[PDB]
């Protein structure tokens, strides 16, 4: 399939303090590779994957400037929005930006992205076309037409289809070993009797990459979206992920429930039964 690059920017205005805390994180697919923290003593774009510091100092130097500058703006923007919403300075407000690009299996350009959100709520975002903006509320409209004035539509597209994609390509080849891996989930099933008539069949899947995974319980071959419980995928801390799906079972019917596992790495889907 495809590949993806995403940067996540969050700025939270600290009341009484002039500069807010800024956190920028860079991922490829599901592997983080750069981090920048305002409260970090580095004040420099740090590497966080093994394959990124083969890029020379000219890269780290410009990459730091790039999001020192992105941080500067959020500082200025946090104040601009404080005015758009009639909000006092003693509050704490968050600006969250995420932009990135998607390449296909042949390095092709597929999709661009840029979304902005103020206090966990949608603010402004770039449509699929990359030519249109859509403003969530009133305030975002006074920003929307401001960006439409400067052709922000175009110039986002020239980052997304230019250096963004050329970066994602160069990363997928420099860290060709790490990034093109796939790791089939290491599976196992669990039996916890709860009552004298029911138990719980839990369906585990440890150690897999990428994080895309599909767990589904089935009674007699019929989909079971009812007594099913599914925790969101957890990171194991070593670049691999885990996810388990449990179901409540009437005693003596475990041989009727079937757990089915779908992953990108696996050639064919798994099935687990007691």
């Amino acid at each position, epitope marked *: 399939g495809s590949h993806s690059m995403r940067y996540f920017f969050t700025s939270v205005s600290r009341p009484g303090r002039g500069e807010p805390r800024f956190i920028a994180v860079g991922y490829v697919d599901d592997t983080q590779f750069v981090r920048f923290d305002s409260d970090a003593a580095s004040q420099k774009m740090e590497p966080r994957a093994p394959w990124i510091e083969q890029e*020379g100092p000219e890269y780290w130097d410009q990459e730091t400037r790039n999001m020192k500058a992105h941080s500067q703006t959020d500082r200025a923007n946090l104040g601009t929005l404080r005015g758009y919403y009639n909000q006092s300075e003693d509050g704490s407000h968050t600006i969250q930006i995420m932009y990135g690009c998607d390449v296909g299996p042949d390095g*092709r*350009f597929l999709r661009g992205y840029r979304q902005d959100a103020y206090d966990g709520k949608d603010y402004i975002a770039l449509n699929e076309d*990359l030519r249109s903006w859509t403003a969530a509320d009133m305030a975002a409209q006074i920003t929307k037409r401001k960006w439409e004035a400067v052709h922000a539509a*175009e110039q986002r597209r020239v980052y997304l*289809e*230019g250096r963004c994609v*050329d970066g994602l*390509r160069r990363y997928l080849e420099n860290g060709k070993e790490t990034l093109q891996r796939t790791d089939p989930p290491k599976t196992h099933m669990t039996h916890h009797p709860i009552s004298d008539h029911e138990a719980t069949l839990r369906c585990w899947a440890l150690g897999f990459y990428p994080a895309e995974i599909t767990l589904t319980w089935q009674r007699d071959g019929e989909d079971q979206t009812q007594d099913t419980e599914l925790v969101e995928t957890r990171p194991a801390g070593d670049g691999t992920f885990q996810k388990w799906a449990a179901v409540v079972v009437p005693s003596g019917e475990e041989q009727r429930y079937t757990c089915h596992v779908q992953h990108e790495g696996l050639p064919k889907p798994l099935t687990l039964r007691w």
Partner: antibody
Amino acid sequence: QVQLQESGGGVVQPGGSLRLSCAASGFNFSNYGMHWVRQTPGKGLEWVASIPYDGSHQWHADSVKGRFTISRDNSKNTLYLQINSLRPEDTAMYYCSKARISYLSAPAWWFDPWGQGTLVTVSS
Amino acid sequence: SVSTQPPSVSVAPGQTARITCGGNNIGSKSVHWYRQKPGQAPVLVVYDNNARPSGIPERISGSNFANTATLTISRVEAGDEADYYCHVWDSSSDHVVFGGGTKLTVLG
């Protein structure tokens, strides 16, 4: 994987008309601008004409304005260059290239990738 | 619409080559660079002043400031022998403007 294939060139005679075509593969051709850039053998590159994603307008260099007309067929993924009243000056190789950025209303950003091109040579 | 390149640049193998693309306020235009080896098509090696495409090695770097864009090739290999053209877009001309081209020779 993006591929451009020029054709239709060859040896022509002055005054005549000639039609170049560029067959495209490896991208939603309906979304990008396309360009023609020619090169007289032993000389530099020269921009000819270019056309936006839909064919709305038609950008012309002045040295070939009025005589050339560039078009595209999005249903065929093909870029065309029509040459009318061929002259000895049009003797050159004609490259076809795809504007990198999408939905550009005018041919302002860099052209990548370039096809191997076709050769147009006119003489008596 | 006037952008001028030197006609040829000769450099010793392993040295650092430097090709200029001068123009009136060319620093305020977006300059690109294409490398064309004999008989083949031009290849984008530097776009928007300094960006390198995926396949281009880091030896090749771009630059553009004031009135002169500059293509720099560090640690010249023999395979760097080709013609090099810069690319701008003249807003006030409706013309994409190529440079004259520079024939880089790495002498043996």
